[PDB]
């Protein structure tokens, strides 16, 4: 299971979704209610640290797994307007994420495309939650096809 989020510049979320494998019909045992918002706000610190630097620990829009913490692989992405696309990776065992950078990158690229399609609405201003079910339908089909 994976918790996905898009966070504003003033530390607020515009999108949040949690999606799991169907074998575990309930997902993230006891971490979902308490741990997963807090470790994401913790990772916002180090994504804010690496946004301004030149040579990382190329092209600065994607970046790798940013930390590893209670066996959870936390993967980020930084848009052009400053939005941050932090999405974590859970499993009962340890998880490999770097092998999915052939696929994950493409996933962050077209959800960036979806966010640009959201932003081009003149009615939708920033610091608003993305309250659209069509956006949910596209991001869960992209979650299915980029598993």
């Amino acid at each position: 299971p994976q918790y996905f989020a898009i966070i504003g510049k003033k530390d607020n979320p515009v999108y949040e979704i949690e999606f799991t494998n169907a074998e575990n019909p309930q997902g993230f045992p006891q971490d979902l209610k308490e741990l997963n918002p807090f470790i994401l706000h913790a990772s916002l610190d180090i994504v804010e640290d690496l946004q301004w630097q030149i040579n990382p620990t190329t092209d600065n829009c994607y970046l790798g797994k940013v930390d590893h913490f209670y066996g959870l692989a936390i993967t980020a992405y930084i848009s052009y307007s400053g939005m941050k696309f932090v999405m974590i990776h859970g499993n009962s065992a340890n998880s490999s994420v770097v092998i999915d950078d052939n696929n994950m990158r493409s996933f962050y690229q077209e959800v960036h495309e979806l966010y640009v399609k959201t932003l081009m609405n003149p009615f939708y201003k920033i610091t608003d939650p993305i309250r659209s079910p069509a956006f949910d339908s596209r991001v869960r089909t992209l979650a299915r096809k980029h598993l």
Binding site: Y3, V14, Y15, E16, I17, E18, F19, T20, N21, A22, P25, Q26, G27, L32, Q51, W52, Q53, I54, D59, N60, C61, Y62, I78, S79, Y80, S81, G82, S106, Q109, E110, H112, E113, Y115, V116, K117, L119, M120, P122, K125, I126, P129, I130, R131, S132, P133, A134, F135, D136, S137, R140, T141, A143, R144, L147
Partner: protein
Amino acid sequence: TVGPKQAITSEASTTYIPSRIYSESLLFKRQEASLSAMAFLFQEMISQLHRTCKTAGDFETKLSDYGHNIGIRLLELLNFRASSSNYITKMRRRDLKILDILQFIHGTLWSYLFNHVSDDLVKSSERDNEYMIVDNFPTLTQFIPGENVSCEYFVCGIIKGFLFNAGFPCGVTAHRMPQGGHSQRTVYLIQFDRQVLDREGLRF
């Protein structure tokens, strides 16, 4: 009813495909319109703001907010279309110096808003954090008498809206320096703050 400010939903991956409702191509088709129609909408903008405002200053800030609401849109659209959709593409530089986002403006923004590239772009010798962006002929506002400058703030309202949302907060004012054969030349100067500069003071 998907994302409120109240909770997060949990739904399984690899389930059924849901309905298809709305979609559109992000890449631009090449569309053209007359200069007269956009000039008419521009003077109607300035006429309504002349009608519903008292003095010059808050009129200028309202016009700059009008430009801001194009610029914060326009940043991601131009960078995403300069990176290249469903077609396989990567991610540009996402530039983070001061001296190359102004290069990005003078190269791509003015050649996107207008047919022609922006003319000159120089620094200030007398002081740092002051940058000159200059054209020779403003095609937004060529239809007003030249002694008023406040109607020229809309386009620099774009530029502040291009800059503050990109991570470099700043402030812009515009003046008219009648140099050479061009009677209207329209310098826009960009005043940054100290808190960005020492940031790139920290980065060697």
